[PDB]
Design a protein around this ligand. Structure first.
Ligand SMILES: [Zn+2]
Ligand SMILES: [Zn+2]
Lengths: 276, 136, 285, 283
RNA sequence: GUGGAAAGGCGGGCAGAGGCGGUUU
């Protein structure tokens, strides 16, 4: 079942210098051909899911009525007993760490985390509704690389003994602060009832990402990512068969992640709510 | 050879004075090619080492080229030329040999399009200082 | 003849270069999403009694690549008779283990005339490590993942030989839906997304009985020269059985292929594509 | 076990150099020992590694001076003895400075459960083996203000070339040295973000973070501060608790502590219960 | 009717300890 694809396009700005790393002694991830860094789709989706699962872990009692699959979970992880899904929220163990993943289609249909990000399950699956595309540099930040400027820099951090002041240096390649990337998130509108709650939850996790960090050291002040939204287009079900521009476009030029939910979700989206 | 001069550097200033006077005879901006620009800079720093001049005494002039280098790179020249003269005043002696290379370059730069010729001037002035330390 | 070249311009990495059966799977999922299940029943009938697509092939800046025919291995010595015998040996095995040819050299291989291989491949298969983090006590546990990365102007194209009315209603609306979802692989990380353009390409092929397939075929009889590609798949979370396909560049003599229907215990039948895409070739003696 | 989120306390202000500071790293012309700079703007900043690492250092010596007093408040401080593991090269032989990094010993709890009771490792994090307690604070990199960026435009000097000399005592021969130093008076926008993970003991972590700041206003901040190169000062612009709902509804109704012209010692000693009385009402 | 569905390269780590730009004729 399909209705359209709300597409969010924006610029990701590294206000502080960013590190993701691939394993200068700690090199950041790069393209294999040009040598430029980027931000993977796995790092941005995996951070938005991690920030939003801790958001849902704190509100399991208050969201039983809106999301009926959160009545089966108690806050915590299944790590203190090496056992699969039983009562705790962080139920699925992948390799060595514990993650909320719903075990079925019918349970992940009513979870705020897994109706959006997806669930693996056994005997049934639940695919994602969002696509978090990789974020390469802007075209403006690419000719600085062509002119010869540094797009990555070497941050040398040391470790000091508390008694003797013995110093122990190390290096960390870091994408230069100020650099701008371009992101894109494509939300697949599968259900015409669930879409307002899914865009609000995606923008909530993007608002937790602006006060937390993205990749790398972070507690030492690396990530500090800012979101600028260039535009919002809807691309309805009728667009895909005829190709003519029925794209409902929500306009946001200087709007923040908070200003898109600062009563703006109900107002600006008055046409997507109209054509469903 | 760039490495061969270091065997000879370690009256000898006169044999390189013809190389400095020939480079001071050509004063047009971008009058040499890319490989020829660095070949001039080896002859300059070898000449500036026989009658040796320290980088500190130059360090105020090197500051004004670099603070403008951030201001030229997506962000005046007479302020550097006024300092390049006044720093050459309090010699003692080899500051005039460094003034005979800056002031022909800076007189042409004094009226010039800013974005291109200073960025090409900045590559030559690095290699003078850069190669000066390679020999001492 | 004249083909339609559907050019897929990458927005990122691909999981794989998609075969002809995972393009017809992706087209078939795009039609039931846009139109419905009654239009998939007409999409299948238009390829059984009509149009045929190929596998996906790379390009690199208007240099379209095509698979090497399997006809040039028996007669490789016979192609290179006019060459210096001190270097016939290294020319032979370098030409033999090549995988792709461009349009100038693909035409010369169908007529068993001498040719050259490309020097650069337009992509690289890259090993990117990912991680899985515990939510509370952030324990890293890595796994390794494969991706195809393309150059700055390179990409992926596939061919279409059929009537324009079927292309305008089925294949062309599918590629705009499939540009925004993925074309096989981890599409939740932005892999498989692309921009679509349409062109027209011409291949000058000799007229004979024997013909090379530009797609996987699932042959109905014994082929002449072939390479076994053994793949299965996955259909709505149900594992498809491994079927013996034929590779791209294998040589048949009047073999249409055949579209296999697998029950698979699913709401609807699952058709696996398996059809030929012939261009005439001259075999050796 | 049971990581939960209640919101973030964000501390914004202006680090001021009352005497000129020097952080430094290991250009072609330039001072032998230069200061770290932003690679895109060329202005000297203060890293978040250098500010977190000095606060964690000064808070660890503050614990060993009072292991008799802090032991009753926090469990797992009776797990050791005061001192370092420097003589006996052992990763856990019962001293406070238990983990070596490469050659030097730093207090790091080895397990998640002993790090949730330590005051040093709740606020700053642990990373043991199989443990990995993440931090509760983020210390951003501190760039210049919008005022002191305009001073670089107008031509005023941001840095300086301080010259020092070590004198041989017997022969009176002098060896000179030059060190780059930010001009005293320059200011830096810092930011410290505490994650309210547990509403039980958020109040102890805010008092322990502000205790370490007033230690750092007594000592220096990086690079030869026994000679004068510290004397740093926190000036608090804003103090703000962002509740969980803040990120839901996006409204700018998140509760604020004025903190105007107040010191790091005023926030703990003078008015800690008066200022934070309204944060406690929402939690 | 897609060799698919799910998965943050991450946790902890002060560029630091010492040094009268002044001797001497
Ligand atoms: Zn769920
Ligand atoms: Zn501790």
């Amino acid at each position: 079942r399909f209705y359209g694809k709300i597409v969010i396009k924006g610029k990701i700005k590294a206000v502080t210098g960013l590190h993701i790393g691939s394993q200068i002694d700690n090199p950041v991830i790069k393209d294999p051909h040009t040598g430029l860094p980027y931000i993977p789709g796995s790092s941005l989706k995996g951070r938005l899911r991690s920030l939003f699962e801790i958001l849902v872990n704190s509100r399991l009692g208050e969201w039983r009525e809106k999301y009926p699959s959160l009545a089966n979970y108690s806050p915590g992880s299944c790590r203190p007993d090496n056992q699969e899904n039983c009562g705790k929220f962080f139920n699925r163990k992948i390799n060595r760490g514990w993650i909320h993943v719903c075990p079925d289609y019918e349970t992940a249909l009513a979870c705020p985390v897994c109706r959006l990000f997806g669930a693996s399950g056994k005997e049934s699956n639940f695919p994602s509704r969002i696509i978090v595309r990789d974020a390469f540099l802007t075209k403006e930040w690419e000719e600085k690389w062509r002119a010869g400027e540094a797009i990555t820099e070497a941050k040398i951090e040391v470790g000091i003994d508390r008694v003797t002041s013995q110093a122990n240096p190390r290096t960390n390649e870091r994408v230069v602060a100020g650099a701008e990337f371009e992101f894109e998130i494509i939300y697949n509108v599968e259900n015409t009832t669930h879409w307002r709650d899914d865009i609000k939850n995606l923008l909530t996790a993007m608002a937790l990402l602006e006060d937390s960090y993205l990749g790398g050291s972070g507690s030492r002040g690396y990530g500090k990512v800012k979101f600028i939204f260039d535009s919002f287009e809807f691309r309805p079900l009728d667009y895909y068969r005829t190709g003519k521009d029925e794209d409902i476009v929500s306009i946001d030029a200087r709007e923040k992640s908070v200003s898109d939910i600062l009563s703006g979700f109900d107002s600006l989206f008055s046409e997507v709510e109209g054509k469903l | 050879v760039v490495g061969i001069k270091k065997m000879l550097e370690g009256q000898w200033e006169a044999i390189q004075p013809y190389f400095d006077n020939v480079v001071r005879e050509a004063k047009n901006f971008l009058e040499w090619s890319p490989n020829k620009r660095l070949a001039n800079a080896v002859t300059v720093a070898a000449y500036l080492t026989s009658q040796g001049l320290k980088t500190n005494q130059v360090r105020k002039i090197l500051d004004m080229a670099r603070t403008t280098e951030l201001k030229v790179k997506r962000g005046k020249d007479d302020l550097v030329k006024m300092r390049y003269l006044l720093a050459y005043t309090v010699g003692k002696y080899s500051l005039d040999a460094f003034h005979r290379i800056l002031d022909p370059m800076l007189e042409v730069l004094m009226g010039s399009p800013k974005k291109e010729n200073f960025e090409k001037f900045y590559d030559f002035l690095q290699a003078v200082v850069a190669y000066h330390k390679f020999f001492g | 003849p004249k083909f339609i070249a559907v050019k897929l311009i990458p927005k990122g990495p691909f999981r794989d270069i998609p075969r002809a059966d995972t393009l017809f799977g992706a087209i078939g999922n795009a039609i039931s999403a846009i139109h419905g299940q009654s239009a998939v029943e007409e999409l299948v009938d238009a390829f059984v009694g009509g149009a045929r697509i190929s596998s996906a092939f790379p390009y690199s800046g208007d240099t379209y690549y095509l698979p090497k025919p399997l006809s040039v291995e028996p007669a490789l010595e016979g192609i290179l008779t006019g060459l210096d015998e001190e270097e016939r040996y290294t020319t032979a095995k370098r030409l033999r283990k090549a995988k792709y040819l461009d349009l100038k050299n693909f035409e010369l291989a169908l007529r068993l005339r001498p040719f050259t291989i490309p020097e650069e491949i337009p992509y690289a298969r890259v090993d990117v490590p990912r991680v899985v983090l515990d939510r509370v006590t952030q324990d890293s546990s890595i796994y390794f993942w494969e991706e195809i990365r393309f150059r700055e102007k390179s990409g992926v194209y596939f061919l279409y030989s059929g009537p324009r009315e079927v292309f305008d209603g089925y294949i062309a609306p599918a590629m705009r839906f499939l540009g925004d979802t993925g074309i096989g692989g981890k599409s939740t990380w932005g892999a498989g997304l692309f921009e679509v353009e349409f062109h027209e390409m011409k291949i000058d092929a000799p007229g004979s009985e024997y013909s090379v397939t530009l797609s996987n075929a699932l042959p109905t009889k014994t082929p002449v020269l072939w390479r076994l590609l053994r793949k299965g798949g996955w259909s709505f979370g149900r594992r498809k059985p491994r079927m013996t396909f034929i590779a791209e560049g294998s040589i048949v003599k009047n073999d249409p292929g055949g579209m296999e229907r697998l029950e698979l215990g699913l709401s609807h039948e699952v058709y696996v594509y398996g059809l030929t895409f012939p261009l005439g070739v001259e075999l050796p003696e």
